[PDB]
Amino acid sequence: SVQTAATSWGTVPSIRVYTANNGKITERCWDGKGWYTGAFNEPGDNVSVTSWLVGSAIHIRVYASTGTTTTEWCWDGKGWYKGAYTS
Amino acid sequence: SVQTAATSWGTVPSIRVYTANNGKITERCWDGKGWYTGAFNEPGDNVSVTSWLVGSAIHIRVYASTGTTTTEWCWDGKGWYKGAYTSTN
Amino acid sequence: SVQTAATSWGTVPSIRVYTANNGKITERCWDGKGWYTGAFNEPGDNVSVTSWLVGSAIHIRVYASTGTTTTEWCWDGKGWYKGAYTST
Numbered sequence: 001s002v003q004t005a006a007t008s009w010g011t012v013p014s015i016r017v018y019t020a021n022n023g024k025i026t027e028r029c030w031d032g033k034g035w036y037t038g039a040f041n042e043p044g045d046n047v048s049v050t051s052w053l054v055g056s057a058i059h060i061r062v063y064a065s066t067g068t069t070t071t072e073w074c075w076d077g078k079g080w081y082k083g084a085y086t087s
Numbered sequence: 088s089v090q091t092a093a094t095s096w097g098t099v100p101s102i103r104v105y106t107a108n109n110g111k112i113t114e115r116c117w118d119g120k121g122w123y124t125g126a127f128n129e130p131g132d133n134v135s136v137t138s139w140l141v142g143s144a145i146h147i148r149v150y151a152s153t154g155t156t157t158t159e160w161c162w163d164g165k166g167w168y169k170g171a172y173t174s175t176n
Numbered sequence: 177s178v179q180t181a182a183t184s185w186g187t188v189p190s191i192r193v194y195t196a197n198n199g200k201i202t203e204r205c206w207d208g209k210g211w212y213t214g215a216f217n218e219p220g221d222n223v224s225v226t227s228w229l230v231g232s233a234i235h236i237r238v239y240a241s242t243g244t245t246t247t248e249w250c251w252d253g254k255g256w257y258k259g260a261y262t263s264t
């Protein structure tokens with residue numbers, strides 16, 4: 001089966017759900033008005049996520065794994081980028 | 088192995104642990120005074136969860152997957168119900 | 177593939193990432209100034225985690241599963257220990 005990870009923030013809330021499906025991770029988003037496909041698109045068979053706020057600014061970290069390789073993907077409001085995480 | 092997902096809220100805290108075992112997801116609850124089996128029961132092989140507070144009110148969302156179908160289940164204080172979540176899979 | 181779980185707290189933030197690989201769960205840590213290996217080391221094939229702050233103090237619960245048995249491991253600042261969690 002597909003494998004998911006979820007995070008949320010605030011009271012509306014905002015929710016992000018990441019799904020690993022046949023080696024591809026995609027993202028679905030809720031901000032109070034319906035679900036849509038987010039910007040996140042990266043390879044992986046496994047996903048986890050965490051997020052935190054600084055004021056009202058969200059910071060998301062997605063950990064994508066294929067075999068024994070885990071890559072951290074980062075969002076701070078302006079595009080996804082690879083983080084410094086190493087195993 | 089069985090697959091779990093966990094969430095917590097507050098500082099006591101309250102904890103909810105969802106376990107997918109042989110296609111069924113069940114819930115175990117902690118509110119500071121021992122574990123007990125909760126009201127959540129849905130089919131699935133994979134599970135994730137998130138939760139948030141609005142003042143003192145807890146809201147939980149559980150994402151249950153079987154094959155490529157993921158269903159969202161919602162708790163807003165008065166029973167579990169199916170949410171609007173969908174995914175293009 | 178390996179399976180991970182992640183938690184974070186505060187605004188720095190602190191992050192903990194747990195990886196289940198070859199039946200062992202290990203932990204990598206971030207507190208704002210580089211990644212390092214954490215104290216957590218327990219058996220498991222599946223992992224989930226949650227954490228909460230009590231003032232400035234972190235409390236972590238890791239749920240490690242092997243077969244149909246899930247064990248809860250607890251951190252309250254002074255070593256990891258098995259918690260009271262049980263399933264069915």
Ligand SMILES: OC[C@@]1(O)OC[C@@H](O)[C@@H](O)[C@@H]1O
Pocket residue numbers: 016027029037038039040060075
């Ligand atoms: O507004 C939607 C969005 O920008 O929210 C933050 C991140 O989840 C992004 O991947 C996503 O596209």
Ligand SMILES: OC[C@@]1(O)OC[C@@H](O)[C@@H](O)[C@@H]1O
Pocket residue numbers: 061072074082083084085191206
């Ligand atoms: O800004 C990116 C970064 O520094 O954010 C905190 C952690 O997620 C790090 O691994 C990551 O490289």
Ligand SMILES: OC[C@@]1(O)OC[C@@H](O)[C@@H](O)[C@@H]1O
Pocket residue numbers: 103114116124125126127162
């Ligand atoms: O008080 C216990 C309970 O109502 O808490 C909220 C949800 O976790 C429910 O499934 C659960 O039965």
Ligand SMILES: OC[C@@]1(O)OC[C@@H](O)[C@@H](O)[C@@H]1O
Pocket residue numbers: 015030148159161163169170171172
């Ligand atoms: O009240 C239910 C609901 O609106 O809550 C926010 C999201 O979880 C939605 O998918 C869901 O339908």
Ligand SMILES: OC[C@@]1(O)OC[C@@H](O)[C@@H](O)[C@@H]1O
Pocket residue numbers: 192203205213214215216236251
């Ligand atoms: O400072 C690192 C550390 O003590 O943080 C709390 C827990 O994550 C521990 O396993 C970890 O070694």
Ligand SMILES: OC[C@@]1(O)OC[C@@H](O)[C@@H](O)[C@@H]1O
Pocket residue numbers: 117237248250258259260261
């Ligand atoms: O201090 C340990 C403990 O009481 O913490 C709260 C829950 O995680 C319990 O299962 C656990 O035994």
